[PDB]
Amino acid sequence: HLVRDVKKREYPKGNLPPDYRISLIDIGLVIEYLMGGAYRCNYTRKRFRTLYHNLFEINHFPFPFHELMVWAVLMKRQKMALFFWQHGEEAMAKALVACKLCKAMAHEASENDMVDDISQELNHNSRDFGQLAVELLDQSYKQDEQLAMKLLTYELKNWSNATCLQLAVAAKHRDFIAHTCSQMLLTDMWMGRLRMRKNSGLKVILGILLPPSILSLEFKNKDDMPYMTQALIPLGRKIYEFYNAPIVKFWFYTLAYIGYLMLFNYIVLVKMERWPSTQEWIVISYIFTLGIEKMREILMSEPGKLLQKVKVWLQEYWNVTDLIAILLFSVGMILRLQDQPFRSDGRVIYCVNIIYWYIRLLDIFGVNKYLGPYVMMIGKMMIDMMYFVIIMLVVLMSFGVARQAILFPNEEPSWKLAKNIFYMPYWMIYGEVFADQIDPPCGQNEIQLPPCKTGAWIVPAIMACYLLVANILLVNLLIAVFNNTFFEVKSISNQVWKFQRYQLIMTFHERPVLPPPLIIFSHMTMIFQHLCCRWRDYGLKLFITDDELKKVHDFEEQCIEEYFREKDDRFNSSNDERIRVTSERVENMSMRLEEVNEREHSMKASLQTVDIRL
Amino acid sequence: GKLLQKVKVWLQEYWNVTDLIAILLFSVGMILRLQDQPFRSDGRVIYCVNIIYWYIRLLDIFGVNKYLGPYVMMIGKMMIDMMYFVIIMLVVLMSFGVARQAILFPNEEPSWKLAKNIFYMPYWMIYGEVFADQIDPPCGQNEIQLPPCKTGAWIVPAIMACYLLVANILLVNLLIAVFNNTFFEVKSISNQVWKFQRYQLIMTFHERPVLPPPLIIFSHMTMIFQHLCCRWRGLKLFITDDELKKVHDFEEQCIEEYFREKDDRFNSSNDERIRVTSERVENMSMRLEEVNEREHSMKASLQTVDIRL
Numbered sequence A: 001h002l003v004r005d006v007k008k009r010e011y012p013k014g015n016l017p018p019d020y021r022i023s024l025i026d027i028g029l030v031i032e033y034l035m036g037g038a039y040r041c042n043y044t045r046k047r048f049r050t051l052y053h054n055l056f057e058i059n060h061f062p063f064p065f066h067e068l069m070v071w072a073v074l075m076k077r078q079k080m081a082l083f084f085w086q087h088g089e090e091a092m093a094k095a096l097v098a099c100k101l102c103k104a105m106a107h108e109a110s111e112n113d114m115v116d117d118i119s120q121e122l123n124h125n126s127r128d129f130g131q132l133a134v135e136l137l138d139q140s141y142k143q144d145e146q147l148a149m150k151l152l153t154y155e156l157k158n159w160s161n162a163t164c165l166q167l168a169v170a171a172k173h174r175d176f177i178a179h180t181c182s183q184m185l186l187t188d189m190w191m192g193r194l195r196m197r198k199n200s201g202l203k204v205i206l207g208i209l210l211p212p213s214i215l216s217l218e219f220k221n222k223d224d225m226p227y228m229t230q231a232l233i234p235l236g237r238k239i240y241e242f243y244n245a246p247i248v249k250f251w252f253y254t255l256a257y258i259g260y261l262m263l264f265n266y267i268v269l270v271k272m273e274r275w276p277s278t279q280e281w282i283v284i285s286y287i288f289t290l291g292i293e294k295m296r297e298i299l300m301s302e303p304g305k306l307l308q309k310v311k312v313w314l315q316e317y318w319n320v321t322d323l324i325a326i327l328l329f330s331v332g333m334i335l336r337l338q339d340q341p342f343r344s345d346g347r348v349i350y351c352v353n354i355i356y357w358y359i360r361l362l363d364i365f366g367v368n369k370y371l372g373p374y375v376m377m378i379g380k381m382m383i384d385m386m387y388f389v390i391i392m393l394v395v396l397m398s399f400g401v402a403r404q405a406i407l408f409p410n411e412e413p414s415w416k417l418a419k420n421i422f423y424m425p426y427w428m429i430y431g432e433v434f435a436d437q438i439d440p441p442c443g444q445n446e447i448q449l450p451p452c453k454t455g456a457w458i459v460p461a462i463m464a465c466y467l468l469v470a471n472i473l474l475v476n477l478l479i480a481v482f483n484n485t486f487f488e489v490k491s492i493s494n495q496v497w498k499f500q501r502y503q504l505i506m507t508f509h510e511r512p513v514l515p516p517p518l519i520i521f522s523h524m525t526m527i528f529q530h531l532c533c534r535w536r537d538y539g540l541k542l543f544i545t546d547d548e549l550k551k552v553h554d555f556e557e558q559c560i561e562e563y564f565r566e567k568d569d570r571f572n573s574s575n576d577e578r579i580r581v582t583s584e585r586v587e588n589m590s591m592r593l594e595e596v597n598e599r600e601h602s603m604k605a606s607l608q609t610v611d612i613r614l
Numbered sequence B: 001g002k003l004l005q006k007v008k009v010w011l012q013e014y015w016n017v018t019d020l021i022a023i024l025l026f027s028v029g030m031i032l033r034l035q036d037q038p039f040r041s042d043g044r045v046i047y048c049v050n051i052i053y054w055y056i057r058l059l060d061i062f063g064v065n066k067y068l069g070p071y072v073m074m075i076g077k078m079m080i081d082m083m084y085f086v087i088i089m090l091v092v093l094m095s096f097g098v099a100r101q102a103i104l105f106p107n108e109e110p111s112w113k114l115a116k117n118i119f120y121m122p123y124w125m126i127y128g129e130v131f132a133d134q135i136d137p138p139c140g141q142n143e144i145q146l147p148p149c150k151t152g153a154w155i156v157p158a159i160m161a162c163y164l165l166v167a168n169i170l171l172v173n174l175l176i177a178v179f180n181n182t183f184f185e186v187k188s189i190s191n192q193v194w195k196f197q198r199y200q201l202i203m204t205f206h207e208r209p210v211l212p213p214p215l216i217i218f219s220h221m222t223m224i225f226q227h228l229c230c231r232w233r234g235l236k237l238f239i240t241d242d243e244l245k246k247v248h249d250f251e252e253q254c255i256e257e258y259f260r261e262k263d264d265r266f267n268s269s270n271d272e273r274i275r276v277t278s279e280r281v282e283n284m285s286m287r288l289e290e291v292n293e294r295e296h297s298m299k300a301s302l303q304t305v306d307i308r309l
Ligand SMILES: CC(C)CCC[C@@H](C)[C@H]1CC[C@H]2[C@@H]3CC=C4C[C@@H](OC(=O)CCC(=O)O)CC[C@]4(C)[C@H]3CC[C@]12C
Pocket: A255, A256, A258, A259, A262, A263, A266, A279
């Protein structure tokens, strides 16, 4: 099923004839499609294409097990694949790749409507291989924490030059990106080349606001852990390593967002004249220079097809709601630069972006380890709040239509009838019963009150039923929902926060130095450098040597051997297996001891016969 | 011994710190009140600020009772969850307030009352006052000619609706859930911490003077006079050496019985019983195989010797 899809999508054939002898080149194209992204497998590298063309001790694969694992995972031979995982090397890479392969064959088989037993069992094998990765990583963390880092970040040349961090995030395997080893390593990329492991927020902000405070900060050495993408003199390196550190580039974009948001408030509370004010020109700068940055994230993303780059970008929901608000603020500008009333309406459009850009402070707030899980808590409870909104919408419009029609009989077609359905009953949920208009005094002589509309006594009574259902039934049931969905959403949103930290370090490592209002200088540097170097890759890898590659390898088979050894020891000392082994040995006692008694019967009988003959 | 270390140990107790702060502000209020106007009203204002603190302290006063004290520590532990709610609600409140003030009043001038109108109306909106006359005021019509509707003023009831839904229904109920799931943990910790702070309670009131604060100046002058005249001219039991011998022997009895009862629980837990039985049964299998081989040889030798006889 896979080989038909990768050949039909390459050169549109259709159903390939079943006699097709699927080449290792063709297997390589299956591997790239299931992996996704920029993974370009060693089969379809241009050297092995030459080798297959020139052949159909340079025939044996240097590390055969790696190719066997991929062979057994693609053909669903699970017990064979788990034996291949133990016997070998780069096992951390092998388990995380097999976790992504098993998940990728899972949704492909469900898409092709292959039988459900295929899709369930491939998702079971994905959880098995992913669980072996956590239990190997934990065992590496117990022995030597520093060598576990090198295992997590070294450049996996046999797996399209990725690292074990990138492979797990691509596999969305949340527990691997939430273990203590990965989080304290992601902290090390966050602080960058700074060793300021204390009161981190205050010292970095004082470095930004007062640039002389950078010189009093403790910086790590040049060989502690060089996480990098592609491979007076103190004081210049001190400023450069500070103003490239990802935690520095965060708070320097954050004090420019808080500086933007403080400025835009001033232009809309205070009047706007015909031409833009000095404050408003800094605002207009911030939106468009951000729009160039949001454009940059699309073009310099992972895929190659422009539409596939766009599809990667639409996945992040905070990124797409940036560009909608940027285009909305542009529309608000062009109207604002015209004569009123066009200006008045572009004033209004400006104030509606305020509804968005304070809510984007929620995402900036997500960096903190306490407010961050609180924010993802809010998003999950709103799905429960939508069901509250639908049930409330029936009860609100049932009171609203009944009140507007009984109290106001002889009305005419107007859209204000629709407003009066939703106006008064909606504010009754929030503490205002509109007490003067509950039961207005009618049909009496105060002056002379107007005559009572027929059936107006029903309006207090259906008010009573509506306020009981709204405020003591459905709001109270929403409280009961929110408690009993709070625990599991808490446990999920901590681990999802710890998993989306990886996105947060890696994007800010790729964002420019200067803030959004000054990003036009760095953006001109990138455009000029790309054009001039033409005339004349992602992630932070450790890029290790060869003799350290051997050593990091030897650390890892000892972790495979010790993991499997403690698994055999825990099984052979668990109470379940001790009762089993005791019971089976006692069963083999009973045939034995009964045989001893029958033979001692013949021995005592032969002793009696010899006693007769002696 | 050092004065700064004395100050730091004293500054560990937070109530003590806020006491010294409140006494300094009451001193400042006294000085401004014993001057003349326009300073006497300011000293009165400082006095009325200080009564808020001297009323809250009642919670520390109430912290001796077995039921109220842990409740006060519970309130203190849920303040942090409220602080997170405060930040989130502040973001939503400022969004509605800025949108309201900028849309409804479009020709204002630089003034600090803009910041008041940002925060005033949305904040009282959370506590059951929707300010019904100013939700959608009638405009753009004659009934007297009402002033023309500001452009986009229809948005204000809609962002009102969304703000009140995300204020009174979402965040408050989420804080109910947050307080409600963490109540058990905070309860257990607050009872244990209250039982711990009772030591500081007894200790401090053992060392405090007898006369009340309004008459502690007599005990304080007695203390300074006693310190001078005697310079010139915890609660322990101080047991005898015999009783030291008895409490010592009591303590080896408890240490022995502790280790012995631990070894009994280890050698009567189901885990060790199953382990020990399994090891014995393994040795039994080797030995019964040996007895089988030997007695088979013995039966064969008995048959051969019976052939001999
Ligand atoms: C780093 C983060 C935490 C804060 C960065 C933002 C502030 C430094 C900015 C944002 C809003 C700015 C204010 C916006 C508007 C004005 C009015 C402006 O006055 C006028 O335009 C008319 C009178 C005159 O010309 O002085 C004087 C500067 C001031 C106070 C600005 C001072 C600088 C402020 C506080």
